Structure formats: structure tokens, C-alpha cells
Protein: Papain-like protease nsp3
Organism: Severe acute respiratory syndrome coronavirus 2
Amino acid sequence: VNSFSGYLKLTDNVYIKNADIVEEAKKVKPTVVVNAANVYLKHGGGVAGALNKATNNAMQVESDDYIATNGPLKVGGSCVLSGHNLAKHCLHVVGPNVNKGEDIQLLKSAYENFNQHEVLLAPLLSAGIFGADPIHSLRVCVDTVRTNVYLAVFDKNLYDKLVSSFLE
Ligand SMILES: CCNC(=O)c1cc2c(N[C@H](c3ccc4c(c3)OCCO4)C(C)C)ncnc2[nH]1
């Protein structure tokens, strides 16, 4: 149903909210929820652990069967699988982990995957323990994504910093 509410409009197609992506998925019932994935789809930590626990591990069982046959994704790549109880589909997107020395330039490729979908609920890619500068990730999002993206950032201090910086 894509019933998004309470978002700050940053550009004609990018929106942001201080919210838990799991609670947004339950309220909004989106066509697509984006997971902040890693290449072998191990859904621990961060957004991935939160989404997988909210599916009672159904996402991890489906992801393990996908990886057994298809092997890992690449950094910057993505994979559509079921959204289970949270969405129609989950778009698993791998941003670079700069705290592990991955290439920050591939963050543009990671966001480009969003352009195959008319509307998405998503986290801020490569943030948290992946180490990218959040202000930089929001700029790459705004400059790359053309479809309608609703960003849920579950940290009030980070959200207030991003909004203040974007409005400069
Ligand atoms: C109570 C259950 N819910 C949650 O624990 C939860 C965590 C959430 C989150 N985390 C951000 C993040 C964004 C990209 C990430 C990442 C972490 O980890 C590493 C890979 O990339 C963080 C910067 C605030 N963003 C949005 N909704 C979230 N919900």
C-alpha cells in the first residue's frame, strides 16, 4: 500500500524520517524494503539483523538457499528476494564497508540499484559500522536515485545532523 507518513521532503524524490525501518515497514506495507546487506547475505547486525529478526528468521533461511546455488553478491550489487511479512519484495543492496577498506566510490553503484523500483523504503547505505560519512551517503543518494525513496534513519542525533547539513 506504500502509505508513507511523517517524512521531511528533501528533494522532489527523496524523503527522510527519524524512524526504525522495521516499524516503518509494518506501518507502510511497502512494495520494496531495502536491506543494508553484505555479499554472503549474513543478516546479523545493523539493519539486516533487525529485518531478519522481524521475519522470525524467514529472510535468513531464504537467503542461505539463494547463496548456496548462486554464490555471493559483489559490492555495489543487489538481489531481489521475498519481503516476507515486511514488504512484497526485499532489495538486498551491498554498500562498501569502508571500515574494512572497501572502495567508497562503489556507493554510487549501490544506490543506482534503487532506480529499477518506482518507490522504496530504505536505510542510509554504508552508515553505522560500515563507516561511510553519513552526509556523503545522503548526497550520493540524492545525486543518483531518480525514483521515490523514503529513508528511515534510526538515530535522532544522526538524523538531525543530516538534515541540518543538507539544508545548508
Ligand atoms: C529495534 C530494531 N531496529 C533496528 O535495530 C534498526 C537499526 C536501523 C538503522 N540503522 C542504521 C544503519 C544503516 C546502514 C547500515 C547499518 C546501520 O549497519 C551496517 C550496514 O549499513 C544506523 C546508521 C542508524 N537504520 C534504520 N532503521 C533501523 N532499525
